[PDB]
Design a protein around this ligand. Structure first.
Ligand SMILES: [Cl-]
Length: 99
């Protein structure tokens, strides 16, 4: 138990694929438990976007702003490893990205 993600300012958009369930609150809780700040809005302070089936506008903004854009598996792996894991190993997915 340690503030391993103290330098992270996260914005979280984690949804079911069919867009009916928003699971962002539980990933928010996991991140805060590791010392991160989680922003309610995707402002200029945000360093990390945790993305699953979120808004296309969020995907695009994360890419264009050059923030770390990671899957939920990143959050789990930091937790289970007790370490700030390399974000490049956990690229987020967007099934519509090349369409
Ligand atoms: Cl799902």
């Amino acid at each position: 138990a340690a503030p391993i993600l103290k330098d992270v300012v996260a914005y979280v958009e984690v949804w079911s694929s069919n867009g009916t369930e928003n699971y962002s609150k539980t990933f928010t809780t996991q991140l805060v438990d590791m010392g991160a700040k989680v922003s309610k809005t995707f402002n200029k302070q945000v360093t990390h976007v945790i993305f699953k089936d979120g808004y296309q506008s969020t995907w695009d903004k994360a890419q264009k702003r050059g923030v770390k854009l990671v899957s939920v598996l990143w959050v789990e792996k930091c937790r289970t490893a007790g370490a700030h894991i390399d974000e490049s190993l956990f690229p987020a997915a967007n099934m519509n990205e090349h369409l």
